[PDB]
Design a protein around this motif. Sequence first.
Motif, PDB file in Angstrom:
ATOM      1  N   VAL A   1       0.836  -1.202   0.000  1.00 58.10           N
ATOM      2  CA  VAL A   1       0.000   0.000   0.000  1.00 58.10           C
ATOM      3  C   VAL A   1       0.871   1.252   0.000  1.00 58.10           C
ATOM      4  CG1 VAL A   1      -1.869   1.208   1.179  1.00 58.10           C
ATOM      5  CG2 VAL A   1      -1.784  -1.291   1.227  1.00 58.10           C
TER       6      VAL A   1
ATOM      7  N   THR B   1       1.440   4.347  -2.789  1.00 58.01           N
ATOM      8  CA  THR B   1       1.202   5.765  -2.533  1.00 58.01           C
ATOM      9  C   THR B   1       2.493   6.559  -2.680  1.00 58.01           C
ATOM     10  OG1 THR B   1       1.555   5.476  -0.161  1.00 58.01           O
ATOM     11  CG2 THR B   1      -0.690   5.192  -0.994  1.00 58.01           C
TER      12      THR B   1
ATOM     13  N   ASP C   1       3.253   7.166  -6.250  1.00 52.20           N
ATOM     14  CA  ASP C   1       2.432   8.301  -6.669  1.00 52.20           C
ATOM     15  C   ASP C   1       3.074   9.622  -6.261  1.00 52.20           C
ATOM     16  OD1 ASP C   1       0.128   9.562  -7.786  1.00 52.20           O
ATOM     17  OD2 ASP C   1      -0.666   9.817  -5.755  1.00 52.20           O
ATOM     18  N   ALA C   2       3.492   9.718  -4.999  1.00 56.78           N
ATOM     19  CA  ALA C   2       4.179  10.914  -4.525  1.00 56.78           C
ATOM     20  C   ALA C   2       5.403  11.224  -5.377  1.00 56.78           C
ATOM     21  CB  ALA C   2       4.580  10.738  -3.062  1.00 56.78           C
TER      22      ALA C   2
END
Lengths: 52, 35, 469, 187, 364
Positions: free
Chosen positions: A26, A30, A33-34
């Motif tokens: 997870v 994320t 993405d950052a």
Amino acid sequence: EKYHSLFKLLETTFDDYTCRPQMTQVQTDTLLDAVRSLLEMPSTTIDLTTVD
Amino acid sequence: EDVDYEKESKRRKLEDEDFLKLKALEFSKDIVNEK
Amino acid sequence: NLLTLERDHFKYLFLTSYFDLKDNEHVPSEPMAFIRNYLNCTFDLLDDAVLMNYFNYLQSMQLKHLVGSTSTNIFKFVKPQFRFVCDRTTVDILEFDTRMYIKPGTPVYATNLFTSNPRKMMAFLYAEFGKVFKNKIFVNINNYGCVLAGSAGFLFDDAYVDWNGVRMCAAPRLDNNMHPFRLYLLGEDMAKHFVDNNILPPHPSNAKTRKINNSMFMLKNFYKGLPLFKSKYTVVNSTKIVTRKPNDIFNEIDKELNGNCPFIKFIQRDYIFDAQFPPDLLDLLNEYMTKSSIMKIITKFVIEENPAMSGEMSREIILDRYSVDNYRKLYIKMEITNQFPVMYDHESSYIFVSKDFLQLKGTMNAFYAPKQRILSILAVNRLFGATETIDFHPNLLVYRQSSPPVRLTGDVYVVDKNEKVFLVKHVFSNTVPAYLLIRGDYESSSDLKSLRDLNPWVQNTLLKLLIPD
Amino acid sequence: DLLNEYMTKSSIMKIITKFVIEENPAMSGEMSREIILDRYSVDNYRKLYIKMEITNQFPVMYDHESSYIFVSKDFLQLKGTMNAFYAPKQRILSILAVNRLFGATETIDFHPNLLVYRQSSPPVRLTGDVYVVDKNEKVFLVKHVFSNTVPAYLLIRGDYESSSDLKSLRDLNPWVQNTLLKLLIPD
Amino acid sequence: MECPFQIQVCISDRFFAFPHNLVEPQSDVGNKLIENLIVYVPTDDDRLYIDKKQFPKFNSVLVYRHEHDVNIDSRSPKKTASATIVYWNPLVPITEIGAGETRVFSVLLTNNLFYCNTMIVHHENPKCPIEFTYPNLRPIACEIPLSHFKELVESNDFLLCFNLETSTMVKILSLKRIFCIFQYRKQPARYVINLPHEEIDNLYNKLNWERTRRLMKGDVPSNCATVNRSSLKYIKQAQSLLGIPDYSQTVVDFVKMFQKIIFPYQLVPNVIIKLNNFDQMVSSAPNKAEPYKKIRLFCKNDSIAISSSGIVPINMPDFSPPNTFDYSDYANRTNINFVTQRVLTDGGFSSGITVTPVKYNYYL
């Protein structure tokens, strides 16, 4: 924090051994993405392999 | 009593409907050149 | 002794006063009598301090557009009572609808005064304005009243009137008033002067015989008069729900509509945003409803029959956000004679979204499905229950390479003879009219159809969807 | 405080306006609010909004007195001069026809090298009244009006040929004539 | 600008022609009636339409072309009492005034006249002419209508010119008079202009500012106008993408047809939102990028209003910052990505997929 995560990951290299960390799936996603964000690229298929 | 103007305004509208007609008299050929 | 009443009954006070009461039975008898007296407006019978307390309680229930207040004389003289500002009004396309010009951002007030009939009286106001200023040029006087560069002015107008919404499009009228038109005032200096003027109009309509209330015109304090009527529903069961999550509401909706009834009614009361409210006040309000209020009929995209799932009719089941933020689901005995907020004839129902159908972003009535790679447009009905959208892109419109001997039936509308785009009628479950977009090699029994020959509803949607941009 | 409630009809008075370039249509209807400012104190100032009025009285003034234009912060007034200024972006010198400058805080001394002698192109043509400041230096003055409302004369130096209708400087207004007489600085 | 005392301005479309009746001899205090009368006109040809004999109440009548002086410019014009003075459709500031209140009559509100004593006697012209364009003809002289008015009465298709040297203000005045005189005709004529028009669109912007200047005191008329080039080309493309039963169908008809839907679907047609968008300023405003200029739209007996953002409570702004918010656990980036990957795998698509949560303002 969207830096600190990466920063920590890379800092682990100061242990210098080529061991590969577990993907905390997870948070890793994320984080990717950052990364995309902070690189501001037009979503040009930023990927785990390039991160590696 | 009807203090408002709308009646007279309608009268104006009628007059404007007539207004174009006068131009024919105003500008048509003339009986004589006085000069 | 002056007639007086307890603080708590302010509930009834406001209720009756503000929403155009009709029934008078169910108010408690003594407060009802007091209210009757107040509507008779014999101010001398009632304590002023009571009134000031009430007004301060209204300041607590902080209704937004209140005019600032300092004196009881607001009840005994003409005064403004609510406050507005001229919105843009900046459009040229449609007719002015007799919505006379106002300077943008002009401040505005509404009076306490209503009349049955313009044009009988306004000469009086004209004389007053003549007092307010001496020298004048080219006043834009009209039927409705004074206008001058906008600026200072006034007019009779209906109660609920919007300010500077761009249209007054046609709609049926429900309500009736003895005095439909409240006066409204423009230009702050008029209201300033009226702070001093402290006057009531002459009332020859009643022979000027000191009558508290007049045959053709009537003051009311803060009377908005919105439509209202008592609930009479044959309640069967109830539940109350507190949450803010919209997806939560949709989950509840799904849970409920796994029940057998084809459809659900749902409502939202209009006033919920206006101010703070006592919960007790909400409790009283629950037993009445406003006929203008927004309501919907919603059904699932019904597919197929479970033979057991039938016979539910006796249950009529409805939902409303009785609270601004909370809901009061109800089961009642199925009934004809009960009455509901007015809705225009032929109004479309709504179809609850499917958990695999994707509403096009910035659109309505249209969606796409991936598993078959198909675009679909409802012929009539309006989407409901979406939470997320996909934006259109032409790449989605993958035209098919299939072998040439294609054939088709039913109406074909060519979209682009060059891009080989077409639209064809379809009915889902032989019950839901819709149209299917298609692209590629396809063929029909000739019989070409023109885009002109179609519903505006679909047409505007297509017009955007083409995105010549 | 007592003195404020009376006024002396001899006292200095001016009106000043912006260099009104353009129309904001919303900027309208203000007339009722007249605006006044004065150093009621020797060193402190009273700013006033008042109801617009006719009958109130103000210090006597000669007819036709020219009000002033507030400085445009993008120009400079010329040292020891009224009536004229310069703008760099277009490299242009400017003189008012009749109006009077206000609000400058600093001036540039004129020097002739400011006057770009644009060698330009063989064909040039110009129209309206033209006044030969110098045949030899190819110097000319030309009527102009900004914003349909701002009469002025444009100095120029260059080919800038014109209609035949050459006009004598003798004919011009004394105000501009004296201004030019200094600005030439034949010194 | 200063507007000096002692002037009155009359706007009237009738002033497109000279109102020989209305003028009366001025007199100074002491009843010094001044039977000398001087008039000024934009051009000497204008003199060719005035009859001295109309004024038996006068005895001495003269006229000249106006000229804008330089040496005598004043905020406070030159005084005179020997003659009454009149100006008629003046373009440029006036520097002379006669005894008593001088009066001036024009069709066009210039900025110069704004803060000035004015009367308009405006009325609604119900009819508006129809603009036309084509890649049978009859000419009309651009300079003067007067020798051609009957023909404009007696036909409904025309084409109009300019000489290349025309002063812009003259162009504006001529156009204004042209439209004003058309607005009394019973059949709205087709008309076209033989001009590159790029600046003429900005001239239409001038016309818009002029109509607003009028509205500052005016009839709130149902005036007809549009942005042309951008709006026009967009509308043309739209109709071409649709059925084109008439390439020359009136533009307003499409709006009128779309009106039928507004209330029953309680929502805004996209066409009207691309309008007030292609407009330079009464718009989302490309001049400034002002998307917040959403329309609020309303109907009879509404308890509600409609906007580009949907339903709203009456007389309220767009949205309340406090809300039954779009609580981000829904529309969480993570969940969004999850769903998006699912979609992508279902589609077998490489790229070009994007998604967004819905939102709500107050009503939900």
